UniProtKB/TrEMBL annotation:
Biological classification of the source: Bacteria, Pseudomonadati, Pseudomonadota, Gammaproteobacteria, Enterobacterales
Catalytic reactions on record: a beta-lactam + H2O = a substituted beta-amino acid
PANTHER family hit by this protein: D-ALANYL-D-ALANINE-CARBOXYPEPTIDASE/ENDOPEPTIDASE AMPH, PENICILLIN-BINDING PROTEIN 4
GO cellular component, one term: outer membrane-bounded periplasmic space
Protein name, as recorded: Beta-lactamase
Amino acid sequence: IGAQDERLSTLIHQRMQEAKVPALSVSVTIKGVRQRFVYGVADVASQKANTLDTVYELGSMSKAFTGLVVQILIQEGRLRQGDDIITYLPEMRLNYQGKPASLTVADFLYHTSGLPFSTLARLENPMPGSAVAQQLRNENLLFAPGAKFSYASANYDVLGAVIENVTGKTFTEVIAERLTQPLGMSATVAVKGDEIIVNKASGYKLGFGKPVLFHAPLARNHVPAAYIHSTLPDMEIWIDAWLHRKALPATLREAMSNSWRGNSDVPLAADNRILYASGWFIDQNQGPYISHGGQNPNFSSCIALRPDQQIGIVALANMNSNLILQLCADIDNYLRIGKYADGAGDAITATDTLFVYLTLLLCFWGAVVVVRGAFRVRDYIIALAVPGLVAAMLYVAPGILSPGLDWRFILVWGPSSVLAIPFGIILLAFVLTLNHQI
Ligand SMILES: *[B]([O])([O])[C]([C]C([N])=O)[N]C(=O)[C][C][C][C][C]
Ligand SMILES: [Cl-]
Ligand SMILES: [Cl-]
Ligand SMILES: [Cl-]
């Protein structure tokens, strides 16, 4: 062989410096020749380095593990795609137009279920003795099952429970017995909680311009959608199984083939005719190009394969960034035509700089009132009610402007600077009524 590609290393350094992720691990496969780029720190405080041993949360790239398991179960005749979900989760009643709806296993595999957006807030919150069927019971679907593609993370939590019901085994054990042990992915695992994982990267999240350590929720029921843990050597083996199925058992080979068959039975938009398969996006354009991003509150990742060209790309990072969600598109552009686009924008970054300006704008306002005021019973009670009256209005405001949304969800996904905005808003109300009391 020969050296790794330096134009390729520059791209990734640039994207990593843009995205401000503490650690970034990328692997690129092109017909056996793997290139590896392993940069940064898995833990910033201890200055613990990013190594090949570092473990990441895969985000939505967990769904291809879940979905392939479903396809193994189907291929062994222990399940059908058209089976009704209530056959396996019999307490899950899901409503469309007031009537219980028929949802097939296919409906959750391909996001044609109609679960509202707020099911992500419900599944991602830990609840110890609460099953998925009980958490979604009496949800009001957005459309008739099968009618539209609409991505909801929680559809793959429904499938986690379906695996658990069919096999009689826990989700961890089906993933191990069926995927990671037969493939050799000896460091990958579906977790059961926030128990201590050796070598896991610390997760970060933008706050006042810098990465801030964030301990994110890890709800057991949400692991089939968001919290399978893995490493770069193991995603390389993953990538390589999907690309070379000959050595694999015939059930795994067949299950894989049916895992890349996109659902063509949904409406398509004028600019998006990409299909969804069993945890993958399918694009015939400059393809087939099979891809999926990973996006957790404090990890992001991406994967993309171009099987006819023996190409696999995967990137892992311990911070949620769109520069990483797009990084596989960048690398595939580079491997295809030698050029790539400028880095896209990031929604957490724009929100953070907005909150910094608003925090300085709130902080400039209070100092004006305190300087002009200091230079110059009923007072204590009245000037304490108004800040608590705004604090009350602020607390109810999410669950009104967007039903099903709440501060707990805002805090989990937004910048660490969110909390400055209500606290700034209510603190500014106290100094003004105390000043208006003066
Ligand atoms: B997946 O689509 O990357 C999914 C994984 C998860 N944590 O459930 N992530 C999202 O859908 C991102 C939702 C952002 C909400 C503001
Ligand atoms: Cl089994
Ligand atoms: Cl257990
Ligand atoms: Cl092959």
